[PDB]
Amino acid sequence: SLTGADLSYANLHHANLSRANLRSADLRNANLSHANLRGANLEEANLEAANLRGADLIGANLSGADLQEANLTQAQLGLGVEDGGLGADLSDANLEQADLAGANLAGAVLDGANLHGANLNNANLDYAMLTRANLEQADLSGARTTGARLDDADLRGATVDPVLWRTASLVGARVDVDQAVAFAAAHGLCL
Amino acid sequence: SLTGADLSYANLHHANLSRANLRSADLRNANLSHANLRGANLEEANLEAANLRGADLIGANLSGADLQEANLTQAQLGLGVEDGGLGADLSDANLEQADLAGANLAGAVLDGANLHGANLNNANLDYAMLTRANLEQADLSGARTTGARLDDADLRGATVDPVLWRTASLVGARVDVDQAVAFAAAHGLCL
C-alpha cells in the first residue's frame, strides 16, 4: 500500500508509478522528475517542493493535493498523443508559486485551484477549466488559452497576454484596472 | 430656387419643405419645428442654432451641414414607419452641442460627423453608422446602439451606458481609462 506512505525526499525520478494509489502520500521534496504517474491517484497528497519536471500526469487525480513550490516544468497533465488520455484532475489543488512553465494542462480541471504566484509561462491551458481559480500574481506569458474557462477566477496582478482577453471565458473574473484597460485594447479599443 | 437662400431666423415651423433643394441655404436660427424635410437636400446648409424639434428628415441629405447648437429633439432622421424611407445622410455634418434627445437616427449615416458635446440622450442609434465620428463629451444615456458602428469614433469623456459596450462595434474607437474599465465590466469582468 502506498496510501499515506512517507515518501518525503524520495528518489523517484523516472519511476513507473502508473495507476499507483498515492492518496494522502507524503511526497514533500520528492524527486518525481519524468516519473510515470499516468492514471495515478494523488488526492490530498503532500507534493510541496516536489520535483515533477517532465512527469507524465495524464489522467491523474491531484484533487486537493498540495503542490506549493513544486516543479511541474513541461509536465504532461493534459490532452496528449498516445491514448485518449484525459486531462488531470487538479480540483482544489494548491499550486501556490508552483513552476508550471511549458506544462501541458490542455483539458485539465483546475476548478477552485490556488495558482497564486504560480509560473504558467508558455503553459498550454487550451480548454482548461480554471473556474473559481486564484491566479493572483501568476505569470501567464505565452500561455495558450483557447477554450479556457476562467469564469470567477481571480487574475489580479497576474501577467497576461492580450490574446487571453480574446480567448478565455472571463465571466465573473476579477481583474485590476490595468488588466481591465488591457482587456479593452485587446478587443480593439484605442487608448 | 431655394439654394443659397437667406432663410436666417425664418419662421418655417410645420412647413412642407419635402424634397426641397436647400443646398448651402442659410437657415441659422431658423424655426423648422415639425417641418416636413423628407427627401430634402440640406448639403452644406448653415443650420446653426436652428430649431428642428420634431422635424421629418427621413431620407434627407445633411452632408457637410453645420448643425452646431441646433435643436433636433425627437426629430425623425431614420428608419421609420410609413414608406421604406432610408436614414438621413449626415456624413461630415457638424453637430457640436446639438440637441438630439429622443431623435430617431436608426440607419442614419454619421460618418465623420462632429458630435462633440452633443446630447444623444434616448436617441435611437440602431444600425447608425458613426464611423470616424467625434463623440467627445457627448451624452449617450438611454441611447439604442444595436447594430451601431462606432469604428474609429472618438468617445472620450462621453456618458455611455454599459449596454453600448456590448452592442456597438468599437474597433479603433478612442476611449478614456474609465470607459475602458466600464467596457470590461460590461463584458462581465469584476473590479
**What are phi and psi for residue B185, nearest 5 degrees?**
-55, -40
- Whole-Å CA distances, B158 to A24, B9, B130, B163: 58, 31, 14, 14
Residue of A nearest to B188 (CA): A171
Experiment type = X-ray
Cβ–Cβ under 8 Å, residues B157 and B139: no
CA distance B68 to chain A (A): 27
CB of B181 within 8 Å of any CB in chain A? Answer: yes
Cβ contact (<8 Å) for A187 and B191? no
Look at residues B27, B48, B43, B108 and name the one whose alpha carbon lies nearest to residue B75. B108
Here the CATH number for the domain that contains residue A117 is 2.160.20.80
Grid cell in block for residue A52: 515533477
Q: How far apart are the first and last CA of chain A?
A: 61
Cβ contact (<8 Å) for A191 and B183? no
Look at residues A68, A72, A80, A37 and name the one whose alpha carbon lies nearest to residue A52. A72
Q: How far apart are CA B62 and CA A24, in angstroms?
A: 76
State the burial class of residue A84 (Cβ atoms within 10 Å of its Cβ: 0-12, 13-18, 19+).
exposed
Deposited resolution, Å: 2.3
- Residue spans of alpha helices (H) in chain A: 162-167, 177-186
**What are phi and psi for residue B99, nearest 5 degrees?**
-105, 105
Question: Angle at Cα B103 formed by Cα B102 and Cα B106, nearest 5°?
Answer: 120
**What are phi and psi for residue A11, nearest 5 degrees?**
-95, 95
The domain tally of chain B equals: 1
Q: How far apart are CA A38 and CA A56, in angstroms?
A: 6
Cβ contact (<8 Å) for B170 and A181? no
B-chain CB neighbours of A170 within 8 Å are 187-189
A to B CB pairs, distance under 8 Å:
68
State the burial class of residue A46 (Cβ atoms within 10 Å of its Cβ: 0-12, 13-18, 19+).
buried
- Whole-Å CA distances, B65 to A16, A56, B41, B151: 80, 70, 10, 22
Q: How far apart are CA A116 and CA A98, in angstroms?
A: 9
| Domain enclosing residue B185, as ranges | 1-191
B-chain CB neighbours of A176 within 8 Å are 191
Q: What's the 3-state SS for B109-162?
A: ECCCCECCCCECCCCECCCCECCCCECCCCECCCCECCCCECCCCECCCCECCH
- Mark residue A92 as left, alpha or beta (left: phi above 0; alpha: psi -120 to 50; beta: remaining): left
CA distance B130 to chain A (A): 15
Grid cell in block for residue B90: 449626415
Cβ-count burial A173-183 (b if 16+ within 10 Å, e if not): bbbeeebbbbb
**What are phi and psi for residue B177, nearest 5 degrees?**
-60, -40
CB of A37 within 8 Å of any CB in chain B? Answer: no
